[PDB]
Paper text:
Intrigued by our prediction of an alternate threading through the OTU fold of EschOTU, we sought to validate its sequence topology by determining a structure. A crystal structure of a covalent EschOTU‐Ub complex was determined to 2.1 Å resolution by molecular replacement with Ub and a sieved model of the OTU domain generated using MUSTANG (Konagurthu et al, 2010; Figs 4A and D, and EV4A, Table 1). The structure confirms our predicted and tested active site residues as well as the overall OTU domain architecture. Like wMelOTU, the EschOTU OTU domain is a pared‐down version that aligns well with OTUB1 and vOTU through the central β‐sheet and supporting α‐helices (0.6 and 0.5 Å RMSD, respectively), but lacks α‐helices above the sheet that would form the canonical sandwich structure. Perhaps the most remarkable insight, which will be discussed in a broader context below, is the permutation of the N‐ and C‐termini that leads to altered threading through the OTU fold. While the termini are typically in close proximity above the central β‐sheet in all other known OTU folds, EschOTU threads a loop at this position and the termini are instead located in the supporting helical region beneath the sheet, near the helical arm of the S1 site. The Ub‐binding S1 site is comprised almost entirely of a primary interaction between a helical arm region and the I44 hydrophobic patch of Ub, and makes very few contacts through what is normally a secondary interaction site in other OTUs. The bound Ub is held in an orientation distinct from the vOTU‐Ub structure (95° rotation) but very similar to that observed in OTUB1 and other closely related OTUs (21° rotation). At the primary site of interaction, the EschOTU helical arm residues C338 and I341, as well as nearby L224, all contact the I44 hydrophobic patch of the bound Ub, and mutation of these positions results in diminished DUB activity. A small secondary interaction site is formed between L241 in the edge strand of the EschOTU central β‐sheet and the Ub I36 hydrophobic patch.
The ovarian tumor (OTU) family of deubiquitinases regulates diverse ubiquitin signals in humans. We have predicted and validated a set of OTU deubiquitinases encoded by several classes of pathogenic bacteria. By determining the ubiquitin‐bound structures of two examples, we demonstrate the novel strategies that have evolved to both thread an OTU fold and recognize a ubiquitin substrate. Our new bacterial OTU DUB structures allowed for the first cross‐kingdom structural analysis, from which we established a framework for identifying evolutionary adaptations in the S1 substrate‐binding site that impart DUB activity. This work establishes the OTU fold as a common tool used by bacteria to manipulate host Ub signaling and provides insight into the origins and adaptations of the OTU fold across eukaryotes, bacteria, and viruses.
Residue numbers in the entry:
A (entry chain A): 185 to 362
B (entry chain B): -1 to 76
Amino acid sequence: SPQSVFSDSVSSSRLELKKQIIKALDLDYWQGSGGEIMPLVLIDFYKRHNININIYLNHCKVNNFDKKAINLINAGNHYNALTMNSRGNIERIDVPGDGNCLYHAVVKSHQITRKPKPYGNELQKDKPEWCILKESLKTHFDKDFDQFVEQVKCILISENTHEANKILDKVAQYSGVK
Amino acid sequence: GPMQIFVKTLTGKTITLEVEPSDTIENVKAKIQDKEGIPPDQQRLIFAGKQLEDGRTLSDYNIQKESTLHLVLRLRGX
């Protein structure tokens, strides 16, 4: 009647600690550390589905375009998409300047070239494409959290704030520093 | 004596540099620009839990042969 046989992949209090860390990082607030995390999670989710993401910062030379990739530009704390026109042009496609420009820019880039989509299904047809993508990325961060811990640490160190240092203490305890 | 070190971005892109213990942090940033195209004022480097400062040398941080530095860029927007 009682449980005699055991195997456990994870601890209960360790899972709660991970959930508290994810909540404090606040992935819906792009101006803080959550806004550095979501582009790394985007690249990894796309890579795992055999699609390349390339991000361009400010005004840069842009030496060789890879048309088969999802191409994005971040200049001025805003994401837009990039594409090629008139046999060689490189053009910027504007997306709304709300807090969700990263996910709008990816959807817009799939729309302009009909590039294969790694997200979504017919159960969410009442839901916007940019929402399905964003929620797929938060799920991925939660389930493969252990693969992003070193990156999360470096992001928090580089922010240099009281708020980030308190989160860094919880990350050090999770990684097993004693 | 010149030694080999690695510089890994948070996406996992790794590059190899050859450096001297007496090279400054800002010189290391120039060598990263020579290989990856990132301007020094977009670069933040981390080693052993500490952000490396302009005006200091690699030796100040006891960086050794085959050490790995972490390169942090600002990607946020939204």
